[PDB]
Amino acid sequence: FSFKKLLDQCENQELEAPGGIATPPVYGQLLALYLLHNDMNNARYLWKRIPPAIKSANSELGGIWSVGQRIWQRDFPGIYTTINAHQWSETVQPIMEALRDATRRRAFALVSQAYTSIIADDFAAFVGLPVEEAVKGILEQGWQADSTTRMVLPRKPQQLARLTDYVAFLEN
Amino acid sequence: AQKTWELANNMQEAQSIDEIYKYDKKQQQEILAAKPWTKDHHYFKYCKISALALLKMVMHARSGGNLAVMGLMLGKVDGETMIIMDSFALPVEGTETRVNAQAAAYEYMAAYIENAKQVGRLENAIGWYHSHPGYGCWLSGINVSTQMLNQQFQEPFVAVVIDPTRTISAGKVNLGAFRTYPKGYKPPDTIPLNKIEDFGVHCKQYYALEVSYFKSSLDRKLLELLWNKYWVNTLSSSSLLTNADYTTGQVFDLSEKLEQSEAQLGRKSEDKLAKATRDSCKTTIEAIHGLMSQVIKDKLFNQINI
Amino acid sequence: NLLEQFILLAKGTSGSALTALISQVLEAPGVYVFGELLELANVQELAEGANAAYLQLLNLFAYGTYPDYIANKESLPELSTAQQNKLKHLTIVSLASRMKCIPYSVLLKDLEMRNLRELEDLIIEAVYTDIIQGKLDQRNQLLEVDFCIGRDIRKKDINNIVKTLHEWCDGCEAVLLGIEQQVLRANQYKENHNRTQQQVEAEVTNIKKTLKA
């Protein structure tokens, strides 16, 4: 609820502009927020909306688009590298800190649903952390893991008023 | 309940359930003067039998045992409906397959009607009924002949046939209301075989009305307050399962009627789509009523004590 | 009615003779609720002396269960085979009141059974005495209870009886109020549709009559 209150605040600022062009940081926030909501079509159209002159002026905008290109191809092992290729200032940094978590949870849901057996090499590149999940996942979440072959096995875990509305409509 | 249910019952004034019990003399005179049943022939399609009349007819039919019994039924008409408000027995003697009403019934009819007019019975004779002890509810040849004779001169008249043996052996009343066609008039055009099997040879000579029953508010209250097995059977009636097959049959002939309406509307003058829509609304309303009963039972019993 | 026989023979006896009658009560088949027997000179003075052990046993048979007997086995006296069967039967009754689908795991742990077959023999025998009714289910390992007797009551559950019944009365009142409101709303919709239908018919006839000479 609190997050939604900030979402609609940035929406209208771009529409009203003294000359049809808003300040650079407003443009960057909308593009990054589109990535967080997985709305890829509007994110692509926003990039096409920015004039070329301002686009080349600020390379910070280009850093958002390079990450957006990877997530547009659903390249899970590649988005984690582009999100760290550039350095984002603290004004836009917290938004990226939430997009990374959203991508991380998205891979977890996709693997558990679309895969019955997945190589540990490929699964680590999906979830994003090939650091400490190798040993922690065996005993905590209960997923049986087999070494050498490296196969992971995901496992699955008031009306009365409505009715009288129907009759009052049908009989009349 | 206050204002909500104060005027919702209003025992001082007759409810909408007791409306049918009021006799309008002027309306009766107007409808009998107009004679709307002379132009058409499938005019009357519904027969509304009161609770007391049905009970008296059933008890009379069973009292004869294996011998036929007969009597008259008072009532009126309203639109396409024949309403039977009462019934009264005749002092006849008959055998297992023949009842004649020779000479004591004809005096009893007039004398009983005269006596009933004295104590405020404004209805006139509307039909005659007889029992078929053990061979279904149908009109025999002589039954069809006497029905024609009654209908040709006393124009409003419906023949009711009861079956005490099947009523007792099945647990539900076996009754049928019928009307007949004029002499040598209207020969309209797996069905014929079963039709002659369960009806008589004169299947096309008469048609069967749709029989429904009604009751007043005082009758309803007295019946539901008679035994404890009537509100227990309401809180556990379990509709949508007692009569699911009837619902499927209604959906089937609804589909047939919809096909006929689609055929008609693409190009006698009856507007079949309206009747199909009315039938669909009716059956959907029974289905939703059953679901409402189930929801009320679930909220009353299941949602108590965690 | 069987308990009434032992009650009258226990109206005056006291001491060792009275305590012997208590053991016979727990051994007589068909005596499963010891309600009237527990409101006699027993509770008045039996908490002192060597006979207080039997008083605790009678309280266990009326309100307690089999697990409540293992915990205080040292204090309570020994029980014959006939008495133990009655105690195990009442344990099934207590579980049936709480839940109407008793798993086999609960019954095995509470009754200290080890073989599934001998547990089912005990359950079937309990059905024969008609304290409980139901049907066993081997595939799901459940006992589906359809009806069970009401065990003994004390003056600390009557408030719970009032609470459950009062909640049911408020449940009926809520349903009744809902039915009235829906009836009124449906009738208002019928009147609104009828009024609009007659309003259009009234307007069309007015313009028709005007030009008819």
**Nearest-CA distance C106 → chain B (Å):** 21
**C135 pairs with which residues across the strands?**
C144
Q: Which residues pair with B75 in a beta bridge?
A: B84, B124
**Spatial distance between the Cα atoms of A22 and A29, rounded to a whole number of angstroms:** 12
Tokens 């996942």, located at residue: A137
The reported resolution of this PDB entry, expressed in Å, is: 3.2
**Angle between the N-to-C axes of helices C16-27 and C52-62, in degrees from 0 to 180, rounded to the nearest 10:** 30
Say which amino acid occupies B174: N
Residue B89: closest CA among B57, B132, B58: B57
For residue A118, give the amino acid letter.
I
Distance CA A41, CA A35 (A): 10
Nearest to B281 by CA among C187, A170, A172, A164: A170
Minimum distance, in Å, between the CA of residue A107 and any CA atom of chain C? 37
Cα Rg for chain C, rounded, in angstroms?
A: 31
Question: Rounded CA gap, B231 and A34, in Å?
Answer: 61
B193 interface with C at CB cutoff 8 Å: no
In the three-class reduction of DSSP (H, G, I as helix; E, B as strand; rest coil), residue B214 is classed as strand
Non-local (6+) Cβ contacts of A145 within 8 A are: A120, A137, A138, A151, A152, A153
Asked whether the beta carbons of residue A161 and residue C182 sit closer than 8 angstroms, the reply is yes
Q: How far apart are CA A152 and CA A126, in angstroms?
A: 13
Structure determined via: cryo-EM
Cα end-to-end span (Å), chain A: 42
**H-run or E-run covering B203:** none
- CA B134, CA B162: separation in Å to the nearest integer? 10
- Which residues of chain B make contact with C171, given a CB cutoff of 8 A? 299-300, 303-304
SS3 B78: strand
State whether A168 and C178 contact (CB < 8 Å). no
Contacts of A162 in chain B (CB under 8 A): none
Report the candidate in A5, A65, A2, A8 with the shortest Cα–Cα distance to residue A35: A65
Closest residue in C to B293 (Cα) is: C179
**Cα(B195)–Cα(C70) distance, integer angstroms:** 76
Best mutation target among A159, A163, A164, A171 (most C Cβ atoms within 10 Å) is: A164
Rounded to an integer, what distance in angstroms lies between the CA atom of residue A154 and that of residue A145? 9
